[PDB]
Amino acid sequence: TPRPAHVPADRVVELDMYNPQGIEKGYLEAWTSLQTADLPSMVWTPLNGGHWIATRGELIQDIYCDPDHFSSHVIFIPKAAGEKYAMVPSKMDPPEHRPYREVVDKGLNLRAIREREPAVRAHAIALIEAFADKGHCDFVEEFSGEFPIRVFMMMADLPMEDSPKLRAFAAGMTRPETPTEMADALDRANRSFFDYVSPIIDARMGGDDILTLSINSQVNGAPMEREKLLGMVSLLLLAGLDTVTNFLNMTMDYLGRHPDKVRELTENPTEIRRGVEELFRRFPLVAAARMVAHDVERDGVELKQGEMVLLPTALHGLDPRVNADPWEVDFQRKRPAHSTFGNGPHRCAGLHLARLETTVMLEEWLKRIPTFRVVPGTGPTYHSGVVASVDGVRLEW
Ligand code: HEM
């Protein structure tokens, strides 16, 4: 197989990150296939312009916490997919990353998410009781595709029905359509909503929100640049609307096929909050990438500057080398080491909102629907990429 000289032959697998083999059997089961086999902790693929793939769990944590040799200047695959139009501070490296994260953390820290807790759970309550009487529901189109969106719009703009039609912008950045066309499709997918957020940063540059608190924030005694200010507000809409609607689908479907696990939470309701990150360990969906900065040797192979390394976070929480029996959900597990929210300086700034949205879901779904099941003979349709999409969850009770 055509490949550079510094990569061996036993470390080569044909794997498209946007369409892996066995994706129809499960996004989690498809990516864990590289662990059940006998492959080193680091593997390489010729698809999408060629890039490395970290497979072992403890190696993914080591790459995230090493920004000196793994730069964030390129986070998407293929290599030249997210150029010119860059998101902030996802595509930044320290010490440049430090001041711009303080802007996103100004409104997304724990205290700011906690002051909205009674309002967030109000959405879950008003959304569940609209179908709790009918005994069934299309969970993807009556909650998971509504509850997280309505929460973030209440914090930001309230465009009603016109942003959910535009929420496909995030679908264009994590599942575009040859590396040349992937970049050109992501190019227009990035600028079409880069122009949509432009009339929002200027009309809100005075005062009085969650995006306004970020635009009016200063950096070293001066506001942010239009390219670096539009990229920050655009990143908040991306992860805030796409990386959470997909998590609720694959979790409630798992709980619908495990009548004992849901009974464990109904008996002890305090185990929900105390075991929230156990769901994040079992169900990770993000697969971020990094560009190697300097020539480094990790896992017995040398990585040359300019290459891309993929970090599928699904191979950290589901790694049997770190978590004993990674398939079973142990709410009482002591040390559930995961990388669902990433690691290092690029930690999920909205992990507390994710932890709060999932707790107010389970606490209000089980208080009204204790027993529930998935519709028999049905299942989701899994689509991979930078952020796993997945669709098709139907519940009965
Ligand atoms: C709900 C489940 C979510 C998951 C599983 C998730 C996952 C991730 C992951 C894996 C990263 C690391 C990216 C990288 O290393 O390049 C990340 C970064 C980030 N996420 Fe999320 N995300 C979620 C929701 C959110 C929400 C609701 C927000 C709200 C704005 C958000 C804001 C961010 C930001 C700002 C970063 C970049 C942090 C930095 O550059 O230092 N995320 N997320």
Author numbering: 9 to 185, 188 to 218, 221 to 409
Paper text:
Cytochrome P450 enzymes (CYPs) are heme-containing enzymes that catalyze hydroxylation with a variety of biological molecules. Here, we report the newly identified CYP101D5 from Sphingomonas echinoides. CYP101D5 catalyzes the hydroxylation of β-ionone and flavonoids, including naringenin and apigenin, and causes the dehydrogenation of α-ionone. A structural investigation and comparison with other CYP101 families indicated that spatial constraints at the substrate-recognition site originate from the B/C loop.
